[PDB]
Design a protein around this ligand. Sequence first.
Ligand SMILES: *[C@@H]1O[C@H](CO)[C@@H](O[C@@H]2O[C@H](CO)[C@@H](O[C@@H]3O[C@H](CO[C@H]4O[C@H](CO)[C@@H](O)[C@H](O)[C@@H]4O[C@H]4O[C@H](CO)[C@@H](O)[C@H](O)[C@@H]4O)[C@@H](O)[C@H](O[C@H]4O[C@H](CO)[C@@H](O)[C@H](O)[C@@H]4O[C@H]4O[C@H](CO)[C@@H](O)[C@H](O)[C@@H]4O)[C@@H]3O)[C@H](O)[C@H]2NC(C)=O)[C@H](O)[C@H]1NC(C)=O
Ligand SMILES: *[C@@H]1O[C@H](CO)[C@@H](O[C@@H]2O[C@H](CO)[C@@H](O[C@@H]3O[C@H](CO[C@H]4O[C@H](CO)[C@@H](O)[C@H](O)[C@@H]4O[C@H]4O[C@H](CO)[C@@H](O)[C@H](O)[C@@H]4O)[C@@H](O)[C@H](O[C@H]4O[C@H](CO)[C@@H](O)[C@H](O)[C@@H]4O[C@H]4O[C@H](CO)[C@@H](O)[C@H](O)[C@@H]4O)[C@@H]3O)[C@H](O)[C@H]2NC(C)=O)[C@H](O)[C@H]1NC(C)=O
Ligand SMILES: *[C@@H]1O[C@H](CO)[C@@H](O[C@@H]2O[C@H](CO)[C@@H](O[C@@H]3O[C@H](CO[C@H]4O[C@H](CO)[C@@H](O)[C@H](O)[C@@H]4O)[C@@H](O)[C@H](O[C@H]4O[C@H](CO)[C@@H](O)[C@H](O)[C@@H]4O)[C@@H]3O)[C@H](O)[C@H]2NC(C)=O)[C@H](O)[C@H]1NC(C)=O
Ligand SMILES: *[C@@H]1O[C@H](CO)[C@@H](O[C@@H]2O[C@H](CO)[C@@H](O[C@@H]3O[C@H](CO[C@H]4O[C@H](CO)[C@@H](O)[C@H](O)[C@@H]4O)[C@@H](O)[C@H](O[C@H]4O[C@H](CO)[C@@H](O)[C@H](O)[C@@H]4O)[C@@H]3O)[C@H](O)[C@H]2NC(C)=O)[C@H](O)[C@H]1NC(C)=O
Ligand SMILES: CC(=O)N[C@@H]1[C@@H](O[C@@H]2O[C@@H](C)[C@@H](O)[C@@H](O)[C@@H]2O)[C@H](O[C@@H]2O[C@H](CO)[C@H](O)[C@H](O[C@]3(C(=O)O)C[C@H](O)[C@@H](NC(C)=O)[C@H]([C@H](O)[C@H](O)CO)O3)[C@H]2O)[C@@H](CO)O[C@H]1O
Ligand SMILES: *[C@@H]1O[C@H](CO)[C@@H](O[C@@H]2O[C@H](CO)[C@@H](O[C@@H]3O[C@H](CO)[C@@H](O)[C@H](O[C@H]4O[C@H](CO)[C@@H](O)[C@H](O)[C@@H]4O)[C@@H]3O)[C@H](O)[C@H]2NC(C)=O)[C@H](O)[C@H]1NC(C)=O
Ligand SMILES: Nc1nc(=O)c2nc(CNc3ccc(C(=O)N[C@@H](CCC(=O)O)C(=O)O)cc3)cnc2[nH]1
Ligand SMILES: *[C@@H]1O[C@H](CO)[C@@H](O[C@@H]2O[C@H](CO)[C@@H](O)[C@H](O)[C@H]2NC(C)=O)[C@H](O)[C@H]1NC(C)=O
Ligand SMILES: *[C@@H]1O[C@H](CO)[C@@H](O[C@@H]2O[C@H](CO)[C@@H](O)[C@H](O)[C@H]2NC(C)=O)[C@H](O)[C@H]1NC(C)=O
Ligand SMILES: *[C@@H]1O[C@H](CO)[C@@H](O[C@@H]2O[C@H](CO)[C@@H](O)[C@H](O)[C@H]2NC(C)=O)[C@H](O)[C@H]1NC(C)=O
Ligand SMILES: *[C@@H]1O[C@H](CO)[C@@H](O[C@@H]2O[C@H](CO)[C@@H](O)[C@H](O)[C@H]2NC(C)=O)[C@H](O)[C@H]1NC(C)=O
Ligand SMILES: *[C@@H]1O[C@H](CO)[C@@H](O)[C@H](O)[C@H]1NC(C)=O
Ligand SMILES: *[C@@H]1O[C@H](CO)[C@@H](O)[C@H](O)[C@H]1NC(C)=O
Ligand SMILES: *[C@@H]1O[C@H](CO)[C@@H](O)[C@H](O)[C@H]1NC(C)=O
Ligand SMILES: *[C@@H]1O[C@H](CO)[C@@H](O)[C@H](O)[C@H]1NC(C)=O
Ligand SMILES: *[C@@H]1O[C@H](CO)[C@@H](O)[C@H](O)[C@H]1NC(C)=O
Ligand SMILES: *[C@@H]1O[C@H](CO)[C@@H](O)[C@H](O)[C@H]1NC(C)=O
Lengths: 137, 48, 97, 49, 404, 455, 48
Amino acid sequence: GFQKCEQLLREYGQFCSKINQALHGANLRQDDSVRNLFASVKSSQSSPIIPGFGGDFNLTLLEPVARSAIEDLLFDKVTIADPGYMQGYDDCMQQGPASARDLICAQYVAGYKVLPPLMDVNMEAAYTSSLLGSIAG
Amino acid sequence: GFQKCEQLLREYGQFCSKINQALHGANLRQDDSVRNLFASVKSSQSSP
Amino acid sequence: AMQTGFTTTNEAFQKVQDAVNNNAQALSKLASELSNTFGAISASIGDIIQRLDPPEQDAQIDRLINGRLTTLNAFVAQQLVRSESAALSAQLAKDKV
Amino acid sequence: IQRLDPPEQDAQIDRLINGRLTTLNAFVAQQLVRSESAALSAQLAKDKV
Amino acid sequence: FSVDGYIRRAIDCGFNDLSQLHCSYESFDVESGVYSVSSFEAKPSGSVVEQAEGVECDFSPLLSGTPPQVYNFKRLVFTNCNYNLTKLLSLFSVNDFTCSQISPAAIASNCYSSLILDYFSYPLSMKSDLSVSSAGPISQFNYKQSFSNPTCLILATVPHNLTTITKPLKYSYINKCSRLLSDDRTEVPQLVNANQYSPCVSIVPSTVWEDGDYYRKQLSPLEGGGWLVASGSTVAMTEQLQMGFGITVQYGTDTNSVCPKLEFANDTKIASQLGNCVEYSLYGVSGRGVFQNCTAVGVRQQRFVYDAYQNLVGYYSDDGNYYCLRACVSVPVSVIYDKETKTHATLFGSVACEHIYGPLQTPVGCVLGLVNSSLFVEDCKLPLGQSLCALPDTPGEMRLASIA
Amino acid sequence: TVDVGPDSVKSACIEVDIQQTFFDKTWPRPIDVSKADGIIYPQGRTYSNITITYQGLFPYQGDHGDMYVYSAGHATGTTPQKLFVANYSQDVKQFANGFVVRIGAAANSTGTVIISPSTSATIRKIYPAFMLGSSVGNFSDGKMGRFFNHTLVLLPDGCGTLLRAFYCILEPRSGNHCPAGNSYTSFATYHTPATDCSDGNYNRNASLNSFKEYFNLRNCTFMYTYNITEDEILEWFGITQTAQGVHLFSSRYVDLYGGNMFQFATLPVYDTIKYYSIIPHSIRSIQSDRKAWAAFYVYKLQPLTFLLDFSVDGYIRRAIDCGFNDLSQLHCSYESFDVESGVYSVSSFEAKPSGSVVEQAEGVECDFSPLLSGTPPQVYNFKRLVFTNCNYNLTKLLSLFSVNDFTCSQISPAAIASNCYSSLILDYFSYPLSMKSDLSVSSAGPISQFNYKQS
Amino acid sequence: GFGITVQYGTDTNSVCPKLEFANDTKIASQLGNCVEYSLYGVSGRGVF
Ligand SMILES: *[C@@H]1O[C@H](CO)[C@@H](O[C@@H]2O[C@H](CO)[C@@H](O[C@@H]3O[C@H](CO[C@H]4O[C@H](CO)[C@@H](O)[C@H](O)[C@@H]4O[C@H]4O[C@H](CO)[C@@H](O)[C@H](O)[C@@H]4O)[C@@H](O)[C@H](O[C@H]4O[C@H](CO)[C@@H](O)[C@H](O)[C@@H]4O[C@H]4O[C@H](CO)[C@@H](O)[C@H](O)[C@@H]4O)[C@@H]3O)[C@H](O)[C@H]2NC(C)=O)[C@H](O)[C@H]1NC(C)=O
Ligand SMILES: *[C@@H]1O[C@H](CO)[C@@H](O[C@@H]2O[C@H](CO)[C@@H](O[C@@H]3O[C@H](CO[C@H]4O[C@H](CO)[C@@H](O)[C@H](O)[C@@H]4O[C@H]4O[C@H](CO)[C@@H](O)[C@H](O)[C@@H]4O)[C@@H](O)[C@H](O[C@H]4O[C@H](CO)[C@@H](O)[C@H](O)[C@@H]4O[C@H]4O[C@H](CO)[C@@H](O)[C@H](O)[C@@H]4O)[C@@H]3O)[C@H](O)[C@H]2NC(C)=O)[C@H](O)[C@H]1NC(C)=O
Ligand SMILES: *[C@@H]1O[C@H](CO)[C@@H](O[C@@H]2O[C@H](CO)[C@@H](O[C@@H]3O[C@H](CO[C@H]4O[C@H](CO)[C@@H](O)[C@H](O)[C@@H]4O)[C@@H](O)[C@H](O[C@H]4O[C@H](CO)[C@@H](O)[C@H](O)[C@@H]4O)[C@@H]3O)[C@H](O)[C@H]2NC(C)=O)[C@H](O)[C@H]1NC(C)=O
Ligand SMILES: *[C@@H]1O[C@H](CO)[C@@H](O[C@@H]2O[C@H](CO)[C@@H](O[C@@H]3O[C@H](CO[C@H]4O[C@H](CO)[C@@H](O)[C@H](O)[C@@H]4O)[C@@H](O)[C@H](O[C@H]4O[C@H](CO)[C@@H](O)[C@H](O)[C@@H]4O)[C@@H]3O)[C@H](O)[C@H]2NC(C)=O)[C@H](O)[C@H]1NC(C)=O
Ligand SMILES: CC(=O)N[C@@H]1[C@@H](O[C@@H]2O[C@@H](C)[C@@H](O)[C@@H](O)[C@@H]2O)[C@H](O[C@@H]2O[C@H](CO)[C@H](O)[C@H](O[C@]3(C(=O)O)C[C@H](O)[C@@H](NC(C)=O)[C@H]([C@H](O)[C@H](O)CO)O3)[C@H]2O)[C@@H](CO)O[C@H]1O
Ligand SMILES: *[C@@H]1O[C@H](CO)[C@@H](O[C@@H]2O[C@H](CO)[C@@H](O[C@@H]3O[C@H](CO)[C@@H](O)[C@H](O[C@H]4O[C@H](CO)[C@@H](O)[C@H](O)[C@@H]4O)[C@@H]3O)[C@H](O)[C@H]2NC(C)=O)[C@H](O)[C@H]1NC(C)=O
Ligand SMILES: Nc1nc(=O)c2nc(CNc3ccc(C(=O)N[C@@H](CCC(=O)O)C(=O)O)cc3)cnc2[nH]1
Ligand SMILES: *[C@@H]1O[C@H](CO)[C@@H](O[C@@H]2O[C@H](CO)[C@@H](O)[C@H](O)[C@H]2NC(C)=O)[C@H](O)[C@H]1NC(C)=O
Ligand SMILES: *[C@@H]1O[C@H](CO)[C@@H](O[C@@H]2O[C@H](CO)[C@@H](O)[C@H](O)[C@H]2NC(C)=O)[C@H](O)[C@H]1NC(C)=O
Ligand SMILES: *[C@@H]1O[C@H](CO)[C@@H](O[C@@H]2O[C@H](CO)[C@@H](O)[C@H](O)[C@H]2NC(C)=O)[C@H](O)[C@H]1NC(C)=O
Ligand SMILES: *[C@@H]1O[C@H](CO)[C@@H](O[C@@H]2O[C@H](CO)[C@@H](O)[C@H](O)[C@H]2NC(C)=O)[C@H](O)[C@H]1NC(C)=O
Ligand SMILES: *[C@@H]1O[C@H](CO)[C@@H](O)[C@H](O)[C@H]1NC(C)=O
Ligand SMILES: *[C@@H]1O[C@H](CO)[C@@H](O)[C@H](O)[C@H]1NC(C)=O
Ligand SMILES: *[C@@H]1O[C@H](CO)[C@@H](O)[C@H](O)[C@H]1NC(C)=O
Ligand SMILES: *[C@@H]1O[C@H](CO)[C@@H](O)[C@H](O)[C@H]1NC(C)=O
Ligand SMILES: *[C@@H]1O[C@H](CO)[C@@H](O)[C@H](O)[C@H]1NC(C)=O
Ligand SMILES: *[C@@H]1O[C@H](CO)[C@@H](O)[C@H](O)[C@H]1NC(C)=O
């Protein structure tokens, strides 16, 4: 926010335009990557998952509880900071940083932003759930 | 080994920590790549 | 047997954690580099302005600019490398499904 | 150090630092590019075997 | 610019977020999409200031008796006091007042951890010998200023009516200072370090009797053996005594408690502005942020609490409270733009709408310009994140649609 | 100057018995950085609940330091006699960057009475006394330990209730057993508990008065006292020196139980301290009341990078000396006390010089004689002397002229007179001093434009 | 006025202050050791 700095920054050309455009393209790339990947996981036809799916083969691990049990375990066991997509701005003010070097609260201080993913969790779960039900057939 | 330089180097942050960690990871990557590659070339059964 | 799988001996599991750690590292570059002075008297532009007159003030602000422009270029270069890698990987995932 | 006093000595050492930091960043960037490439290539080798 | 050079159309790049977008691409037509633009800045609503307030820093010693020679300069160190350079400068006829690594305006107005004042008798005729670039006897053997800390040098003449400062018989200096090693073949010049005294000070008398006097001390084995030798020189005394004053200031070894005096308003207190974004200056430490009342952490005696990235994150105030310090936080901005309709919506990602049809709270932040539609799409061109999509009305307002 | 009370009126000093054998004990207490021994807290700030590296003056991990122990003097029943000391006053050390002291570490343990090895007693904390200064040498009989000019003396007194700091000239007294007198051995301080340490009124000048028996205090510029609450708690003391003066650090006013040192005083001592010594102290206890006094340990400081673990309350409880070993370097590079298993590259083990080799041209002096003979040329006709393959001495030339202005550019002042060159080119000419500025690089006047310009 | 200009590497840097030499600063006497060197103005560290 310092005007003297901004005045000197201008002598380096459209530096920030380049930073923004490069990241914008890089970010579009994931939305396109995700869209393409899920378009391909998507089943045409699938059977419903019902409790008992698998018969004598115990697939309860994979059945939706909705994410599956293994899927929730996989997420619970990985340490991931919560980006605060809906109201992180406020969490970092009313509670403040969770710990030293909190990179989520650093966003509003340093000048960077973590963007949300293209699909929410329930949609991704829907894709793999429909995939599960399509395997046998 | 010059102390004056090291004193000035410190004002650039943990530069060398970044260099070392980046290369350490890059080097682990080959040990993992090699281990995985050979695990797959490995035969279960073979004739002499 | 896999219910007990998500532990220290599960290579696939560490790869999941490492993907997460890589995202954190990418953000740590921006969070940690603003405290550097890059040879300047302060990492704070406000301190430079408050202490120095324009002919020297300029040089000090400029050191901070060069350091920060460098940091952002490095960041972007890595986001492009990482996004290219993830995209190739996504096509591998496509093939495996 | 032998030729200059601190206010100028600093500027000269700093030029060498900037150049060397730049060199190391370039080196690392390439080791990461080259190791990423080799890793992809290794998976190709895996498939060919 | 048209072919004929006239400006017919323009964008004010700071007007809104849509305008910022056009400027970043240097075009009046940009493609549809969701773009990040500069954040909406929080601005200060006031300021808080805390400074040491109390005792004046005492320059009295300086004004009483005969000042020392340049190699015996006396040092006054000021900490935890209110300084006023005019108060001292106004007592002398200043001949030359210059500063290095600090501006002129700053020397008289900033807060310091310490201010060190070195005063001595000094002929004005040798003015240049105090220059950093000088290779003469003063800078090599008598007095040298810091290269690390900001410094000022004042050369001034004592007025005829400032009768409390007396004159030495002559000005004097060391023109040689060296060690003779035990072999008595090698002689090593002993240069003075910045802010220190020459090793020959102990052999050179407070006044050199006459130009050319040679001094010698036998050194003990603990001192490396050999001899320390020096030669003095003199300058005839002037009608009015000429004096040098070196000033060295440090900015962060302690609370920066050496400050100009300040008359405080009670609207610059922290307690009265909690929760607001304010500019602050706390014992020389400054920046912008939001103060909050909170549980004390860190060592109280040290006043300023820092985080792992060296930001100031807390402060122990002289009013007895501990405050947490948060940055004034900017509000994220993304522009949702549709080229075909020439319409847009603004997303404040991660922000509750309490800080911003009225605003719509969504799973990805607060969005203005969208209307909630309870409609589903598959064909989403302006994804917002999660499973949300901006859908243009086609023009009307964009609808907030969910991806099916 | 400061009045520090009257001179001693005694004609003699108490005889001092120096028997170093009795003080040659092995009671090692090296710095344990993992327990944060010897750490001076970062001075202008605090931190909470973080681990960071920090650059500052710290003792080395594993440093044993120098142990010093004070003892009881000689006695015969109820009448104390001769003082009993170690050879400390003569053991002068280089100050360098200062030091930290571990005080009272052995308190509450059963120890030894040094003067009587077979006698045991509970160990009590005792405070160290120091003499510091710019220059040292010997006394009248050739023994070392004399300090010249102003000397800083840190002398605890009041049976351990005050620290007295003063900067003064120490003038050796000439009486019997005094440093400028007859059967001198070592000066020492003492107190006599029987009369000096009454339950109520402690003699706050007991050690000062004994010091004064050996030296007259002259031109004192200051004398400050600091109060110490009595306890048997291990504490740290430290001393450093900057342009602002001598800084005294202590753990007892901020982190009494923890041990981190904080500054409590700055003394107006501006000459550089180069040397220090321990002032031996001997307690004139009766034979039947000898105590064991805790040894103190002095450790030297140096500019090291440490990994410092700041607790929620801000104290440093744990640290890594990042230059101690390769494992320590690893922890510092990740700024953590816990790093993952693996094989890591760390800084190489440097080869260090074992000596030096020098070759220089040695021979003919470079000849500045032409310069000194006849009328010098005008500025536009300057004459040039080019010196190659010769020994130069600028003083030899400079000393022949009254130099009005000598400045250098792109070379330091120290360097111009000391470095080797491929060539030295000397351009000399007549030049009025009134046109001094016209030779400046920035000048646009006639000299710099049409007559003479430097490279 | 006296102008002084110095050059640092067009030839052996043979314009030096005079030095009294010790015979422990010879190269032949320190072969195989790491030493600091100053040879006609050229300096650094190394093993001869
Ligand atoms: C840092 O340190 C510097 C130096 O110490 C401080 O600067 C000084 O600040 C003081 C004010 O605090 C300032 O005093 C002012 O001086 C002027 C000048 O008047 C002189 O000349 C007139 C000529 O007519 C004389 O009549 C007058 O008596 C003075 O004469 C002096 O010299 C002669 C010899 O020639 C001596 O014989 C005299 O004794 C004397 O020394 C005054 O006019 C001014 O007066 C106003 O303020 C005072 C406040 O007490 C008030 O009582 C007066 O009635 C008058 O106030 C009215 O007018 C003002 C507008 O001017 C208006 O605002 C009010 O509301 C009233 O209507 C006062 O005495 C001194 O000169 C400064 N010196 C220097 C060198 O700068 C600086 O402040 C310090 N900084 C900090 C932060 O503390
Ligand atoms: C670069 O170029 C510069 C300049 O040419 C060189 O610096 C010179 O170095 C020489 C030494 O090599 C140095 O000479 C020394 O001078 C002092 C000063 O004494 C003068 O004053 C006393 C006052 O009591 C007189 O008694 C004395 O005679 C001198 O008087 C001079 O001036 C008067 C007029 O006022 C004339 O009438 C006189 O004739 C004279 O010109 C001497 O005290 C010193 O003497 C010691 O060394 C000599 C060596 O020959 C020895 O013989 C003496 O006995 C004595 O040595 C003892 O004491 C020393 C400790 O001091 C101890 O170490 C020994 O072991 C002995 O116990 C000597 O003559 C000259 O002043 C310097 N000049 C300048 C300007 O710096 C520099 O060396 C060159 N660099 C290199 C690398 O070559
Ligand atoms: C830092 O500390 C050092 C060490 O203490 C001081 O150096 C000492 O300085 C004093 C004097 O300043 C030396 O003491 C004596 O100085 C006499 C000077 O003579 C003149 O002044 C006297 C004053 O009464 C007159 O009587 C006399 O006529 C002169 O006008 C010398 O004459 C003395 O010499 C005696 O001892 C020598 C020893 O060889 C004999 O040969 C003589 O015949 C005679 O007996 C004496 O020198 C003192 O010696 C110095 N000490 C050392 C160890 O060198 C520094 O001055 C002090 N520095 C500062 C800046 O305060
Ligand atoms: C020789 O022997 C003496 C005693 O005979 C030892 O002195 C004791 O040392 C211990 C440890 O340093 C002291 O214990 C500390 O006491 C602190 C305050 O105690 C005061 O206040 C509490 C209430 O807050 C009272 O209950 C108590 O009686 C005192 O009035 C505590 O705050 C400290 O706890 C802090 O540190 C510990 C870790 O050590 C943490 O776990 C705590 O959370 C907290 O951070 C601690 O309890 C003890 O009080 C001292 N005695 C005296 C009389 O003071 C000497 O140390 C020993 N000497 C040697 C060399 O060994
Ligand atoms: C006849 C008489 O009164 N003699 C006194 C000594 O006591 C007698 O002789 C000794 C051998 C014992 O057997 C006693 O039981 C006997 O009555 C008295 O002796 C001192 O006794 C202590 C123990 O109580 C010990 O033996 C003393 O020796 C040392 C010591 O304390 O270890 C020897 C040390 O090397 C010496 N230290 C130094 C640095 O020299 C000390 C020191 O001299 C004393 O502690 C001084 O107070 O003594 C032994 O001397 C003796 C002193 O109390 O006086 C005799 O008159
Ligand atoms: C024990 O040690 C302490 C050091 O902590 C030492 O303290 C000193 O005491 C003397 C007095 O005995 C103080 O000197 C006095 O200070 C006052 C301050 O206002 C002066 O007014 C006094 O001046 C009068 O007396 C002088 C005596 O010669 C006269 O010359 C003069 O004209 C006045 O009549 C006098 O200067 C001294 O300041 C303190 N020092 C410190 C550092 O506090 C104490 O004396 C020692 N006690 C013993 C018994 O030795
Ligand atoms: N008068 C007096 N003062 C004392 O300080 C004193 N101290 C002791 C005991 N001193 C000590 C000190 C350290 C160790 C000790 O245990 N050291 C370890 C080695 C520690 C290391 O080097 O890391 C050991 O095993 O010996 C024992 C006794 C006995 N009498 C005394 N008597
Ligand atoms: C001091 O820092 C530690 C981190 O080293 C905090 O411990 C963390 O607390 C959070 C709270 O949600 C837990 O989720 C983490 O798993 C804890 N980490 C560890 C390593 O235990 C500790 O709470 C901090 N203390 C204070 C008072 O803030
Ligand atoms: C004072 O006493 C000490 C300790 O006895 C002496 O230091 C010892 O000197 C011998 C000499 O060979 C060394 O071998 C020892 O290793 C030294 N001890 C220590 C702990 O370093 C000291 O030199 C004596 N000083 C004087 C001036 O007599
Ligand atoms: C120490 O203080 C004394 C007195 O303040 C200084 O002055 C000398 O004092 C003695 C006392 O007997 C007189 O005989 C001298 O004639 C005095 N000399 C002068 C020049 O007045 C003494 O100079 C001071 N010493 C130092 C080293 O500062
Ligand atoms: C250091 O301790 C001394 C001794 O307790 C304090 O001096 C006492 O101050 C009280 C104040 O009422 C007097 O009544 C006593 O008579 C004084 N004692 C003596 C021996 O003079 C001293 O003030 C303390 N210093 C500080 C800075 O607190
Ligand atoms: C000193 O004070 C007197 C008092 O009358 C005055 O006349 C004189 O001009 C003053 N001198 C200076 C230099 O101010
Ligand atoms: C705040 O400042 C005003 C200014 O006049 C004063 O009247 C009021 O008493 C002050 N309040 C306090 C608490 O000092
Ligand atoms: C800060 O909080 C403490 C307790 O949480 C309280 O007692 C104190 O008065 C508060 N201070 C302010 C300025 O509100
Ligand atoms: C839009 O309105 C519907 C009402 O059916 C509500 O369920 C939905 O959450 C709303 N969306 C937002 C972002 O408010
Ligand atoms: C030091 O000792 C020598 C002889 O041992 C004696 O001549 C000299 O005067 C002594 N120095 C002092 C300061 O007494
Ligand atoms: C080496 O130096 C010593 C110093 O005295 C000298 O005696 C010896 O003769 C020298 N050796 C040679 C070969 O010159």
